[PDB]
C-alpha cells in the first residue's frame, strides 16, 4: 500500500 | 495497491 | 491494483 | 504502508 | 508505516 | 564490458 | 560487450 | 556485442 | 569493466 | 573496474 522500492545501480 | 518498483540498472 | 513495475536495463 | 526503500549504488 | 530506508553507496 | 546480468526470481 | 541477459522467473 | 537474451518464465 | 550483476531473489 | 554486484535476497 503506497510503498516505493527504487534502485539506481 | 499503489506500490511502485522501479529499477535503473 | 494500480501497481507499477518498471525496469530500465 | 507509505514506506520508501531507495538505493543509489 | 511512513518509514524511510535510503542508501548512497 | 558494459554487460548486464539481471535476475528476478 | 553491451550484452544483456535478463530473467523474470 | 549488443546481444539480448531475455526470458519471462 | 562497467559490468552489472543484480539479483532479486 | 566500475563493476556492480548487488543482491536482494
C4:B3 CB<8 A: yes
This PDB structure is determined at a resolution in Å of 1.0
Query: G7 has which bridge partners?
Result: F7, H7
C-alpha cell at J2: 566500475
User: How far apart are the C-alpha atoms of G2 and I4, rounded to whole Å?
Assistant: 11
Residue of chain F minimizing CA distance to G3 = F3
Residues 1-9 of chain D with CB under 8 A from chain A are: 1-9
What was the structure determination method? electron diffraction
Q: What is the CA radius of gyration of chain B?
A: 8
Amino acid at each position: 500500500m503506497y510503498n516505493k522500492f527504487v534502485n539506481f545501480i
